[PDB]
Amino acid sequence: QIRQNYSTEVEAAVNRLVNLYLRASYTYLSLGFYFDRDDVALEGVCHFFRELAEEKREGAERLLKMQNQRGGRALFQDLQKPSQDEWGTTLDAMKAAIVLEKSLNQALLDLHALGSAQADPHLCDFLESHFLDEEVKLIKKMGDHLTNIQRLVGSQAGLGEYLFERLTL
Amino acid sequence: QIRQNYSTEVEAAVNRLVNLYLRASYTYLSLGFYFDRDDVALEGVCHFFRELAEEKREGAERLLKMQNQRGGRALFQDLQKPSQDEWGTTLDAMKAAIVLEKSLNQALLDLHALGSAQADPHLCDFLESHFLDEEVKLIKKMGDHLTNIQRLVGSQAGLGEYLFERLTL
Amino acid sequence: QIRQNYSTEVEAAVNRLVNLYLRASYTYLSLGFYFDRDDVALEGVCHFFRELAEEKREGAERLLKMQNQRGGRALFQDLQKPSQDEWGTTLDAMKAAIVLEKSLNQALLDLHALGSAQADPHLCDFLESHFLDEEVKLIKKMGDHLTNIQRLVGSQAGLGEYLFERLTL
Amino acid sequence: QIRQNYSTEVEAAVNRLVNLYLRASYTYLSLGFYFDRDDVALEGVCHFFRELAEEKREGAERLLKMQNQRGGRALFQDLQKPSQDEWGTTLDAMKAAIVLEKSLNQALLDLHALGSAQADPHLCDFLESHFLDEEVKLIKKMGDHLTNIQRLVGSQAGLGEYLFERLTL
């Protein structure tokens, strides 16, 4: 058929990466609606996490498209529900979001390493152009938010959270 | 004449609901001008309650229009003055506004229940399309405001009230 | 808080309905990418199921928004993977899609019935306006497709599938 | 001069790759004019292969430009005539086109592997951005066409070929 220089190991890892992205998307949808509760009511934080949900979903779809293009076979698994039902403060949420992005990034780097080992340049390029740079920029942005949240919730935690949501997000 | 499947019980309840809406409107006009006093001076809160006064007045007029369309007879009663002359802080005001909206909502649901009992689908539809959804959205919005006010007036009550009026309203 | 006339039974059912919609969306994403395989290659069928994936996701998000507005608490569960990994012919796929939509519709009607029992008109209206009509139109459309597929794959199954994808989808 | 980190092995391989691309272009020009014969008369297939002829020629010219930029020396060889004078059916032609693209892709991957061995990142990047992704997409597209042709020429080969040329190409 069309399949060429595309190892079963890469195929399998691509499928696992699809699962991680759809799970991240699901986590971010839960984060977003949490911040939209009447007893939380931080619209800007809700909007930030809903954007991220969409981004992660796009990520998965690009992976799935790439899987088809290489002649791999997509295989879907159960999507585990997010690790929490309530996400605490903006501070807690942004910490959990960075932890999540780091673990996506690590999976991207593992796939890239596998790609190199197998001499699969097309895999490596595709991750490079579409995933690795974006993750880096996103993680930088989240780190910056985290610094600003922390500096604001020194004293006057409630005031700090409100001001962050209003003037940054 | 035109009157068809429109019970005297519904007619009476519609008239009482008109009275509740005009009273709410009157309450909100008093809330608005309170916040416009030189010793209160929270323009954004004044503007929020003046919008609500207009909305409640529209509500009443739609009810009165519906009463005519069904061939009921409008009957006006005295409008009781608002329960307070001074409304305290933004926090106090938003609490009183939610209490008021809840009691409008309860009257809307009672009318709907009566409408069902009497097999009056047109009444039920009219409340559905024009009143029940709006009340839900409005009460959600007021709950959100209340959360933000409370989080801001933890410490530094005056600063918190100012920031809310400036950055939310 | 804001919660008013919103029973724990309705809250629970809304959460289950969110799960069904996200599962449908996941099924449709798997259907779409299946038809985009190089050994299936029916772009119009891929595009039809990818539209449906997006629609089901929107459905879930509206439900989640409604849950917040009523003061319910969203709770996420694990999303079960689609019931199949390969979906056979366009005929097989459209049959499975109708079965799925019927089961969403049945859940919508069950929720509506619960809504009535609990005298929760806002729930009933929300399902009415946003879900019940769309499901009906969608199921009609899928039935129509099914008739056309069947009439085409009488003899010359491959020719019939190609012509359907090209001239209908 | 300008030449830096550009091995004679890479230079030689680039020259061979130019020859393969110009040969592919020549093959596609022969495929195109075949389908434009009065006794074949499949304009859409002619147009598809004439586009590919132009694409392969562009490919060669980019390679030759890159050779100059690195300070390599272009060397031209004889271009072998296409392996066939007549190309059979659309099915036969699309099979031969996929075989050809696979062999271009393999040469691109070999050059990339050489590029890595020699620590020549600029070579690797240039193939990545300009060649490897396009080949993958093209081979996917040709596989898809092949599936559709095959499904159509089950029974009624002539009808199937006509419909493919009219509704796909």
Ligand SMILES: [Fe+3]
């Ligand atoms: Fe909102």
Ligand SMILES: [Fe+3]
């Ligand atoms: Fe808003």
Ligand SMILES: [Fe+3]
């Ligand atoms: Fe908004």
Ligand SMILES: [Fe+3]
């Ligand atoms: Fe967006």
Ligand SMILES: [Fe+3]
């Ligand atoms: Fe968006």
Ligand SMILES: [Fe+3]
């Ligand atoms: Fe957006």
Ligand SMILES: [Fe+3]
């Ligand atoms: Fe987008």
Ligand SMILES: [Fe+3]
């Ligand atoms: Fe986006």
Ligand SMILES: [Fe+3]
């Ligand atoms: Fe995006």
Ligand SMILES: [Fe+3]
């Ligand atoms: Fe992006």
Ligand SMILES: [Fe+3]
């Ligand atoms: Fe993007």
Ligand SMILES: [Fe+3]
């Ligand atoms: Fe499979």
Ligand SMILES: [Fe+3]
């Ligand atoms: Fe919880």
Ligand SMILES: [Fe+3]
């Ligand atoms: Fe590379």
Ligand SMILES: [Fe+3]
């Ligand atoms: Fe003023």
Ligand SMILES: [Fe+3]
């Ligand atoms: Fe002013």
